[PDB]
Design a protein around this motif. Structure first.
Motif, PDB file in Angstrom:
ATOM      1  N   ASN D  51      -0.394   3.891   8.635  1.00  0.00           N
ATOM      2  CA  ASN D  51      -1.116   3.062   7.681  1.00  0.00           C
ATOM      3  C   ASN D  51      -0.669   3.285   6.241  1.00  0.00           C
ATOM      4  N   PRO D  53       0.814   2.952   2.831  1.00  0.00           N
ATOM      5  CA  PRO D  53       1.557   1.870   2.162  1.00  0.00           C
ATOM      6  C   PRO D  53       2.931   2.294   1.679  1.00  0.00           C
TER       7      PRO D  53
ATOM      8  N   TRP E  21      -9.753 -11.711   7.202  1.00  0.00           N
ATOM      9  CA  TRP E  21      -8.302 -11.711   7.368  1.00  0.00           C
ATOM     10  C   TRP E  21      -7.848 -12.900   8.203  1.00  0.00           C
TER      11      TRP E  21
ATOM     12  N   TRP G 118      -4.424  -9.522  -0.044  1.00  0.00           N
ATOM     13  CA  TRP G 118      -4.654  -8.475   0.945  1.00  0.00           C
ATOM     14  C   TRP G 118      -3.697  -7.310   0.740  1.00  0.00           C
ATOM     15  N   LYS G 119      -2.476  -7.598   0.285  1.00  0.00           N
ATOM     16  CA  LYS G 119      -1.512  -6.534   0.025  1.00  0.00           C
ATOM     17  C   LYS G 119      -2.030  -5.579  -1.042  1.00  0.00           C
ATOM     18  N   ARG G 122      -5.049  -3.332   0.087  1.00  0.00           N
ATOM     19  CA  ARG G 122      -4.624  -2.169   0.855  1.00  0.00           C
ATOM     20  C   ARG G 122      -4.061  -1.084  -0.055  1.00  0.00           C
ATOM     21  N   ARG G 123      -3.281  -1.479  -1.066  1.00  0.00           N
ATOM     22  CA  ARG G 123      -2.726  -0.501  -1.997  1.00  0.00           C
ATOM     23  C   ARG G 123      -3.826   0.208  -2.778  1.00  0.00           C
ATOM     24  N   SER G 125      -7.037   0.499  -1.839  1.00  0.00           N
ATOM     25  CA  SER G 125      -7.966   1.195  -0.958  1.00  0.00           C
ATOM     26  C   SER G 125      -7.370   2.440  -0.321  1.00  0.00           C
ATOM     27  N   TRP G 126      -6.048   2.616  -0.386  1.00  0.00           N
ATOM     28  CA  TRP G 126      -5.414   3.711   0.341  1.00  0.00           C
ATOM     29  C   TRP G 126      -5.833   5.067  -0.213  1.00  0.00           C
ATOM     30  N   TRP G 160      -7.582   1.071   8.279  1.00  0.00           N
ATOM     31  CA  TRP G 160      -8.110  -0.249   8.589  1.00  0.00           C
ATOM     32  C   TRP G 160      -7.060  -1.346   8.615  1.00  0.00           C
ATOM     33  N   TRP G 161      -5.940  -1.173   7.910  1.00  0.00           N
ATOM     34  CA  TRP G 161      -4.993  -2.269   7.731  1.00  0.00           C
ATOM     35  C   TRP G 161      -4.468  -2.779   9.066  1.00  0.00           C
ATOM     36  N   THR G 165      -5.539  -6.323  10.287  1.00  0.00           N
ATOM     37  CA  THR G 165      -4.414  -7.250  10.267  1.00  0.00           C
ATOM     38  C   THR G 165      -3.600  -7.209  11.551  1.00  0.00           C
TER      39      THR G 165
END
Ligand SMILES: CCCCCCCCCCCCCCCCCC(=O)OC[C@H](COP(=O)([O-])OCC[N+](C)(C)C)OC(=O)CCCCCCCCCCCCCCCCC
Ligand SMILES: CCCCCCCCCCCCCCCCCC(=O)OC[C@H](COP(=O)(O)OCCN)OC(=O)CCCCCCCCCCCCCCCCC
Ligand SMILES: CCCCCCCCCCCCCCCCCC(=O)OC[C@H](COP(=O)(O)OCCN)OC(=O)CCCCCCCCCCCCCCCCC
Ligand SMILES: CCCCCCCCCCCCCCCCCC(=O)O[C@@H](COC(=O)CCCCCCCCCCCCCCC)COP(=O)(O)OC[C@H](O)CO
Ligand SMILES: CCCCCCCCCCC[C@H](O)CC(=O)SCCNC(=O)CCNC(=O)[C@H](O)C(C)(C)COP(=O)(O)O
Lengths: 606, 156, 86, 128, 127, 12, 172, 459
Positions: D51, D53, E21, G118-119, G122-123, G125-126, G160-161, G165
């Protein structure tokens, strides 16, 4: 210079045009499947004129063309031999695949690669198109191998299905095991007959073809899913239904039987091989049929019906009846294609469910689908003057009054009764009775593609039996005067088999419990063949390659025999000759021995 | 990433090195078991029971769902026999010995009765297929110079 | 086939639940944790999910089934498993 | 009662029939309790990298790398020549080679013997 | 038994994010946007022709699409094959060999105008 | 209802 | 971690009926024999002694093995089913979309822009989600594979990603 | 032949004199031009070699092989500017120099009229290949591989040296022509057997022959991609080429002193193909496949049969083209994932649609699907071997069965299946990789139409 040669040759090239245009991609990818079907439809329509020309005058001709090489005394050239087997098969295969192509539009409608799918079907079609027409053995090999590889992708069409790859690999394995006999026949004919053209093999009269015909038999068994090499056909059921109804119904698997028909003149010269075909044809006809009636999947049921039918083809070619065997090819092509295609209708309409123990009560729900099956089922099983009558009971009658294997005759009769057995199982469980599918109904067949395609094959299953049987010239001596009580056994055993199978099927309707019979375990488990012969030999051969071969032989011993032994010896002699102590005393003393002994026992004076 | 010492080494002789190997293979000393070194060179690689990937619970979510392995889990020395499509050790509903007995019995019974069928063949109470022209010696492939031997068919 | 959504799922979910004889029609609530409200032995939830399964035709894992205990819970589980996004 | 289900190396014994899982001893209480502990350790790390990034490359699996190394060069540094390996090498090595020599030499000797006395039909056999 | 309070909250947000989503996985009315493609004279001709859409407009539409399929997929391919089979490959001996014309006792033949004799007197049986 | 489909870039 | 005695017997119940589907086939037979299975399962509720329960299920598993159907009715959208992983050679992962071409990218501007939304989420929330993971991580490594949920507001649940997704089960 | 050697030699300053980033372009275009001039030699006269001078000559045996090497030269160049671009100007310039020195030796070798001149360049190919494997090889074991490669072929070549010089002093001349016309029957004396062993062993090692084959799985696995193909695509054929040429004086001692090699090869093909049924590494899988196909040629050559020889050369070149290609397939996937393991990268058809095709008919060509010249090569050997002995088919036929199972197995595992979850660095395949694949497939299937240009002098 007759037109017959010209148009009949175009039947191949016009079929190849969609393949060439596919790589152009100028075609709209949405309209490609319609383009493919119309080309095959024209291919069938053009394929008519050779047929009526053949019935009218009865001329069979060979189109030899561009010379591939003058192989010293061999003259391998692309040559399209044609005879009754060709000119009869070509419309039948084209008619079926055109109907399948039309159906494939309806069934395979949401697949994003549907255009690729139609590309594969055409590629398979031309591959078998050149399999039936092959003047030389090499061209026969072109189809014999291209048809197997074309099946590999098509059976694994859904690709990511792990089991689908297994069946795809399994299909290649059994096919290539059969191919071992093919190349054995190839070498024998080239060596002991100095050709691969069928003309020279026939003319040179290899009247003792013991080795080739065994190789020919082994080649036939691999492609026709015979006993010992059967289970690839039931396992190749994991592909899409149009894949099943075209190749694995009567247009790919039949190639194995068609192989010996092409070599029938040499087959009759030998006798041992024919008895072997009688043996293999009988066991395949029953054992697969025995494993059929206990299954609960239409694709598995209808597939095993093919292999039992394929077993029946090997029986008739056995006792000097090659043409009637080829007649059985055409009739089996008609009704067997409908059965899978009809089964394709119910599978997709009832949300891709294939278990026969769950559909229930489809008689009045789908009239045409129910109508198609009963006509197809009756044709396969009997029903005189229908399509199956002009082929099956004639074979049964022919095999009756002949000097055959007494045991093999018994298998044909029982399997003929077993032919009605699973036929009842399909009709009783699927269409008759009370329904069992999930509550939300989606039953529908009103799409014109499904109705027209079924109807096109339906009229074939009604009349094509009478047409070609009354049209082709008589190619066999008839059997007219036999006692009445084996002339009717073909009808008797089917009617007899119809009786108890219905009674035993509605014995399930009986409220009482059903015991888990042991014989039922044997038959329902595909005759025990896959659980052992796909698990015992593969494990050993794979285990041998790791423990032996890879580890023990290659990189343990062969690296220690030459390399490590020499490396160890050189290192061992290096550690001593270079570990001098540096003391001047021992150096000179070493010289003193050398000086002494040099002028001494080596006799360095005479 | 991984350093050199984590690579598989020699046979774990002392129990202390057995524990080190078990840690190195991401297992414990209870389940760790080196292959029996008959000289075959398996090293310290932990032998695992013959369990094809088909045996692994499909409903569990794996890091490699296609083959049913999670990350870092020490996979079998014999993975490639036991992948989903290769040799499968799934438990058949009936015993393997019974599995084999009925298979060999049916094949042997079929072959045996086939022979006895050949011993006593089936035919109708009918005779030879009478053929004209001295059994068609000429068109059977015979040589015209060598005249055919006297052959004739009669009538009653 | 027209894909299913919540009002489809919820109606079909309470459909089979109502059809069950011991379940009281007026006691039917999407938020009802079975045994603590509707007296249902532990051997009964494992068998009604089969009716829940046959309603939608996709197998409900036992690991998820033992957690699945409410009419709302079934609706939520069915929708996400069948990528129902509305 | 029907006959039981005897196991085999190719037909394994199912978990449902294994006597061992029947008696869950307090010793086995913790024995199968760290299964999730070690699995979660491997799990939690795996999702964290998966996960992540910042991750762009592939996540190296030490078990996979170890397996490749074990099924490779790290075999001879563990190879001890013993009568079992020695006999196994000869039996799967020189054995079949000599056996194949015997069958071919015998047939070839018989093959040319027939040709020597003219006891083989090669009248049409001209390409070779 | 029964999502735990933390677990049921976990699945709640997981469901919520999943719904949103998948909501983004929708398509706007404008999408897909694509640059135009060089039009063809025949295609635009049939578009303006088929505006009426009457039944007798459809048949000629279907007949023409059947006609140009015949010419470019049968007529031309049979032309080159026949030309190949009539002036190139048949110009070599033993390239196209056919079964002898099967004649029967009683008929007559063309290249000499001779009659193979009628089948002589049959033993004259009946059933 | 139409919805986005993921596909590996075939433009290259 | 451990399937207790109740968990195992319910698993026995579920599998027993599913196999009995392939046997009884017809629904009327099903509703009868299932009720006997249910009734004969209800009788041993007051068994008390847990040892007997293991003995009560000892012959049960083999009895199921005696009467197991060689071709059990397994559901198409399930392992062993006909349509298992069949609709998978089309669910290419989301990350592949980053490697698209601008001409391809310009085709679907709205979805791509929303994907960038959404990208970024995620960045952002990481760091919070990895921090949340370690702040209540159990000692001696994670003991249970279950992950903590989102505790406070705004922050998304950790890891979660890929779950959110994930490709749809019916991508086409 | 100076119309080929001279431009190849003059291309060496061409690269070194080129600019910073223009080295790849000029070298590629002129090497492709050199390939075109090589095609001028495909026409072989009726029954005579195209003898140009005493120094160089060519016949139908080396005519396809020569153009294969020249055609290869762009392909390594097209397969090298990926990992080499991250390097100084000199080292890239040096790399091109070596391959050109490689092909120059290969061009001189196939065209040499004198067996000694054949011999000198035949071993000389070691020097550029050794440095290529060692210098730019991307692994640690390569250092052991260089020793394994160099000594193994030299350990057989050195005894060969004493054999030729013995022939020169005894028979007289040593060129390919006089030997053929002045060939004399070789006796059965034990000295003649050892000369037979010396004249043969050097060529079998480079094929390789089963047992003497362990230098392929070492060299090929961790050789650089460019060096991997040439060593796989021609250098194995270099050992093959000498087999026809030198078996003109070893008659009739070939009939009796060949049984151990036939048994080693006809059994090795089953064993080596059984290797291929399970390989953790894709490149090792391809390397062992080359052992099996080459082992077919050893059987083909040793029978010494007209049909066998034409099948040998047809398979020899056909295997080289496809084996080189499959190595390019490995390099592409290994580049994306930075590893060589089979199961690590899987389900690649979904991610890369066109590469699914490229790996597909690569497998079919490796499978000897008719009419692909892999089939016209293998099938000829079966017929020749079957005439030699009727039991040859049992083994050699079983190879095609085993060859199928592993060939599709790498197609099943890598291309088909499910995409790997964690792998996310696989970008769309560059047109260089796609083009390079086509430069292999198209000439292969194009040449299927005219096998007479590959069937060798015996055709
Ligand atoms: C009349 C002629 C019409 C036009 C013919 C055009 C060509 C054609 O189709 O010929 C058909 C002919 C057919 O011969 P034919 O005997 O049928 O005669 C032709 C004339 N008609 C049709 C009237 C009968 O076949 C050939 O010419 C063979 C073509 C083979 C092409 C091979 C290309 C190889 C390319 C290699 C590239 C890579 C090189 C480096 C690597 C090499 C390998 C290692
Ligand atoms: C001389 C003429 C002889 C004519 C013989 C005709 C026999 C016809 C077939 C009868 C037996 C097969 C049968 O009736 O099959 C249908 C049926 C299927 O039952 P089942 O598979 O258990 O499914 C039940 C689902 N609730 O009911 C069954 O009972 C299936 C039984 C399976 C085993 C059948 C074995 C038949 C063996 C025949 C001989 C084989 C060679 C020796
Ligand atoms: C008379 C009979 C002669 C022999 C006929 C063939 C014997 C069987 C050969 C393999 C058959 C196909 C196969 O590989 O089956 C195993 C497996 C599929 O198994 P299956 O039961 O279909 O289950 C699929 C998942 N549900 O599929 C796989 O595992 C596929 C991948 C591995 C395949 C390895 C196959 C090795 C076979 C070596 C055989 C050597 C000996 C041959 C002897 C006979 C020669 C004629
Ligand atoms: C790794 C080991 C080698 C691998 C396998 C290589 C091939 C095996 C055989 C190697 C032979 C090498 C020497 C051969 C030289 C040329 C052979 C030749 O021309 O034939 C002669 C063969 O004669 C020989 O004696 C040649 C040598 C025979 C073998 C003995 C030496 C070679 C083996 C040991 C050295 C090589 C091995 C390496 C050791 C570290 C004929 O001459 P003649 O004997 O008829 O001469 C006339 C008269 O009789 C007096 O000579
Ligand atoms: C027609 C067919 C003929 C052929 C017939 C063939 C029948 C074969 C199966 C025979 C089954 C056997 O009688 C009983 C067994 O296996 S296991 C008993 C379960 N008992 C326990 O494990 C004790 C602890 N108790 C609990 O865990 C709860 O009570 C429980 C969860 C069970 C219910 O909770 P609630 O719901 O009440």
């Amino acid at each position: 210079m007759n037109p017959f040669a010209s148009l009949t040759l175009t039947t191949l090239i016009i079929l190849t045009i969609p393949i060439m245009m596919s790589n152009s991609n100028i075609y709209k990818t949405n309209l490609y499947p319609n383009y493919v079907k119309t080309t095959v439809s024209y291919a069938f329509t053009l394929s008519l004129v050779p047929l009526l020309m053949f019935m009218h005058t009865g001329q069979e001709m060979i189109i030899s063309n561009w010379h591939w090489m003058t192989l010293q005394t061999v003259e391998l050239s692309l040559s399209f031999k044609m005879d009754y087997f060709s000119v009869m098969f070509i419309p039948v295969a084209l008619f079926v695949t055109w109907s399948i192509m039309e159906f494939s539009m309806w069934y395979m409608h949401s697949d994003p690669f549907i255009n690729r799918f139609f590309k594969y079907l055409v590629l398979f079609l031309i591959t078998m198109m050149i399999l039936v027409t092959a003047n030389n053995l090499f061209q026969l090999f072109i189809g014999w191998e291209g048809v197997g590889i074309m099946s590999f992708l098509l059976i694994g069409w859904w690709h990511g299905r792990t089991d689908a790859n297994t069946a795809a690999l399994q299909a290649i394995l059994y096919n290539r095991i059969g191919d071992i006999g093919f190349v054995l026949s190839m070498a024998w004919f080239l060596t002991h007959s100095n050709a691969w053209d069928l003309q020279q093999i026939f003319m040179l009269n290899n009247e003792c073809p013991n080795m080739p015909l065994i190789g020919l038999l082994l080649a036939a068994a691999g492609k026709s899913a015979q006993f010992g090499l059967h289970p690839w056909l039931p396992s190749a059921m994991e592909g899409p239904t149009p894949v099943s109804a075209l190749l694995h119904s009567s247009t790919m698997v039949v190639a194995g039987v068609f192989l010996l028909i092409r070599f029938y003149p040499l087959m009759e010269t030998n006798k041992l091989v024919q008895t072997m075909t009688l043996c293999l044809g009988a066991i395949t006809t029953l054992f697969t049929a025995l494993c059929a009636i206990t299954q609960n999947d239409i694709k598995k049921i209808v597939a095993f019906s093919t292999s039992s039918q394929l077993g029946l083809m090997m029986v008739t070619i056995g006792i000097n009846q090659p043409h009637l065997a080829f007649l059985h090819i055409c009739m089996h092509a008609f009704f067997k294609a409908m059965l899978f295609m009809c089964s394709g209708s119910i599978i997709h309409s009832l949300n891709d469910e294939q278990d026969i123990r769950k559909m229930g009560g489809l008689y009045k729900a789908m009239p045409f689908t129910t109508t198609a099956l009963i006509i197809g089922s009756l044709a396969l099983t009997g029903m005189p003057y229908l399509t199956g009558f002009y082929s099956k009971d004639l074979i049964i009658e022919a095999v009756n009054m002949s000097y055959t294997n007494a045991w093999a005759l018994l298998m044909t009769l029982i399997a003929t009764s077993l032919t009605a057995a699973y036929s009842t199982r399909i009709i009783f469980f699927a269409f008759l009775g009370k329904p069992r599918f999930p509550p939300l109904v989606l039953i529908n067949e009103n799409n014109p593609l499904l109705i027209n395609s079924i109807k096109r094959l339906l009229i074939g299953s009604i009349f094509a039996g009478f047409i070609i049987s009354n049209n082709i010239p008589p190619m066999t001596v008839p059997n007219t005067t036999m006692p009445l009580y084996m002339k009717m056994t073909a009808l008797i055993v089917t009617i007899m088999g119809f009786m108890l199978a219905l009674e035993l099927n509605n014995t399930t309707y009986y409220l009482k419990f059903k015991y888990p019979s042991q014989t039922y375990k044997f038959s329902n488990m595909l005759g025990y063949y896959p659980s052992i012969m796909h698990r015992l030999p593969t494990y050993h051969n794979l285990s041998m390659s790791q423990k032996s071969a890879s580890s023990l032989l290659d990189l343990i011993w062969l690296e220690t025999i030459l390399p490590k032994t020499t490396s160890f010896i050189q290192m061992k002699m290096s550690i001593m000759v270079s570990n001098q102590k540096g003391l001047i005393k021992l150096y000179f003393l070493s010289f003193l021995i050398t000086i002494m002994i040099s002028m001494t026992l080596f006799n360095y004076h005479e | 990433h991984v350093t050199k010492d984590m690579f598989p080494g020699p046979y774990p002789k002392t129990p202390e090195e057995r524990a080190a190997a078990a840690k190195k293979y991401n297992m414990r000393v209870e389940d760790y078991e080196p292959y029996p070194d008959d000289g075959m060179g398996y090293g310290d690689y932990p032998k695992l029971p013959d369990r094809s990937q088909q045996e692994r619970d499909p409903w569990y979510d794996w890091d490699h769902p296609d083959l049913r392995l999670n990350w870092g889990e020490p996979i079998h020395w014999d993975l490639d026999m036991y992948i989903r499509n290769r040799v499968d050790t799934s438990p058949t509903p009936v015993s393997w010995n019974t599995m084999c007995k009925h298979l060999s019995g049916f094949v042997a019974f079929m072959l045996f009765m086939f022979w006895v069928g050949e011993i006593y063949p089936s035919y109708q109470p009918v005779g030879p297929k009478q053929y004209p022209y001295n059994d068609l010696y000429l068109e059977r492939g015979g040589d015209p110079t060598k005249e055919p031997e006297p052959v004739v068919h009669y009538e009653i | 086939a027209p894909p299913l959504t919540l009002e489809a799922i919820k109606d079909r979910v309470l459909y089979v639940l109502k059809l069950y004889d011991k379940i009281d029609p007026e006691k039917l609530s999407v938020n009802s944790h079975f045994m603590k409200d509707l007296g249902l032995d532990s051997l009964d939830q494992v068998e009604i999910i089969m009716a829940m399964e046959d309603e939608f035709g996709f197998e409900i894992p036992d690991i998820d089934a033992e957690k699945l205990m409410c009419p709302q819970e079934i609706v939520d589980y069915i929708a996400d498993k069948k990528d129902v996004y509305e | 009662s029907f006959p039981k289900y005897k196991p085999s190396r190719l037909a394994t014994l199912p978990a449902t029939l294994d006597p061992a899982e029947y008696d869950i001893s307090p010793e086995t209480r913790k024995a199968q309790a760290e299964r999730l502990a070690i699995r979660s350790r491997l799990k939690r790390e795996y999702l964290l990298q998966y996960n992540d990034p910042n991750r762009l490359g592939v996540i190296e699996d030490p078990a996979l790398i170890r397996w490749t190394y074990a099924r490779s060069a790290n075999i001879y540094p563990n190879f001890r020549p013993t009568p079992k390996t020695s006999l196994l090498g000869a039996l799967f090595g020189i054995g079949p080679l000599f056996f194949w020599y015997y069958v071919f030499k015998t047939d070839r000797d018989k093959k040319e013997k027939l040709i020597q006395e003219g006891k083989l039909d090669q009248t049409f056999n001209i390409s070779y | 038994s029964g999502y735990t309070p933390d677990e049921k909250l976990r699945l709640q947000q997981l469901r919520e994010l999943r719904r949103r989503w998948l909501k983004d996985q929708e398509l706007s009315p404008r999408e897909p946007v694509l640059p135009p493609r060089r039009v063809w004279p025949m295609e635009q001709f049939w578009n303006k022709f088929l505006q009426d859409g009457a039944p007798w407009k459809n048949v000629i539409y279907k007949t023409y699409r059947h006609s140009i399929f015949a010419v470019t997929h049968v007529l031309i391919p049979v032309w080159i094959i026949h030309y190949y089979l009539k002036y190139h490959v048949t110009a070599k001996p033993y390239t196209v060999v056919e079964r002898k014309p099967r004649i029967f006792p009683g008929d007559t033949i063309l290249e000499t105008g001779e009659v193979i004799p009628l089948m002589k007197e049959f033993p004259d049986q009946h059933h | 209802k139409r919805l986005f489909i993921i596909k590996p870039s075939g433009f290259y | 971690a451990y399937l207790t005695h109740q968990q195992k017997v319910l698993r026995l119940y579920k599998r027993a009926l599913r196999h009995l589907e392939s046997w009884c086939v017809h629904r009327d037979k099903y509703r009868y024999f299932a009720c006997l299975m249910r009734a004969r399962f209800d009788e041993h509720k007051n068994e008390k002694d847990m040892v007997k329960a293991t003995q009560l299920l000892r012959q049960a598993e083999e009895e199921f093995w005696y009467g197991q159907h060689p071709q059990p009715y397994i559901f198409p959208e399930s392992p062993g089913g006909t349509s298992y992983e069949r609709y998978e050679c089309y669910k290419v992962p989301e990350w592949c979309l980053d490697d698209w071409h601008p001409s391809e990218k310009a085709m679907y501007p709205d979805y791509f822009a929303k994907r960038e939304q959404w990208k970024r989420l995620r960045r952002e929330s990481w760091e919070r989600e990895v921090k949340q993971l370690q702040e209540e991580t159990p000692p001696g490594g994670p003991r249970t594979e279950a992950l903590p949920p989102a505790r406070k507001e705004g922050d998304l649940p950790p890891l979660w990603w890929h779950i959110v997704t994930r490709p749809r089960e019916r991508p086409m | 032949m100076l119309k080929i050697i001279i431009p190849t030699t003059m291309l060496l300053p061409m690269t070194w004199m080129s600019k910073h980033n223009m080295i790849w372009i000029n070298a590629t275009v002129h090497s492709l031009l050199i390939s075109l001039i090589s095609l001028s030699l495909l026409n072989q006269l009726g029954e005579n070699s195209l003898n140009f001078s005493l120094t160089f000559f060519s016949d139908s045996l080396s005519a396809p092989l020569l153009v294969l090497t020249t055609w290869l030269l762009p392909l390594m160049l097209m397969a090298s500017q990926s990992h080499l671009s991250k390097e100084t100007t000199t080292r890239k310039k040096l790399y091109i120099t070596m391959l050109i020195l490689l092909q120059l030796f290969l061009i001189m070798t196939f065209t040499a009229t004198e067996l000694i001149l054949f011999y000198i360049l035949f071993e000389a190919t070691l020097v550029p290949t050794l440095i290529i494997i060692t210098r730019w090889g991307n692994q640690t074991e390569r250092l052991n591989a260089g020793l394994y490669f160099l000594f193994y072929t030299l350990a057989g070549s050195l005894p060969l040296l004493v054999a030729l010089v013995y022939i020169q002093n005894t028979t007289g001349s040593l060129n390919f022509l006089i030997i053929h016309y002045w060939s004399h029957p070789l006796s059965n004396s034990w000295s003649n057997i050892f000369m037979w062993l010396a004249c043969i062993m050097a060529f079998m090692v480079k094929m390789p022959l089963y047992g003497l084959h362990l230098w392929l799985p070492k060299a090929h696995v961790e050789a650089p991609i460019a060096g991997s193909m040439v060593l796989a695509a021609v250098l194995l054929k270099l050992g093959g080429y000498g087999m026809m040429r030198i078996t003109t004086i070893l008659n009739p001692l070939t009939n009796y002193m060949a049984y151990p090699f036939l048994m080693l090869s006809m059994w090795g093909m089953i064993m080596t193909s059984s290797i291929c049924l399970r390989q953790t590494d894709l490149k090792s899988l391809i390397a062992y496949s080359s052992v099996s196909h080459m082992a077919l040629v050893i059987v083909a050559i040793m029978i010494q049969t007209p049909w066998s020889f034409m099948g040998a050369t047809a398979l020899m070149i056909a295997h080289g083209l496809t084996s080189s290609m499959l190595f390019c397939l490995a390099n592409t996937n290994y580049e994306r994932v930075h590893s060589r393991t089979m199961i690590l990268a899987r389900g690649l058809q979904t991610l890369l649609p066109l590469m699914a095709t490229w790996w597909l008919m690569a497998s079919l060509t490796n499978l000897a699907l008719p009419p692909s010249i892999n089939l016209i090569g293998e099938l000829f050997i079966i017929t020749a071997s079957f005439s030699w002995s009727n039991i040859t088919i049992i083994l050699m036929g079983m190879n095609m069965m085993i060859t199928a199972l592993y060939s599709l197995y790498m197609l099943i595992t890598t291309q088909r299946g499910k995409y790997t979850h964690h792998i996310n660095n696989i970008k769309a395949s560059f047109t260089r990789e796609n083009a390079l694949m086509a430069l292999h497939i198209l000439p292969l299937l194009l040449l299927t139409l005219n096998p007479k240009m590959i069937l060798g002098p015996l055709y």
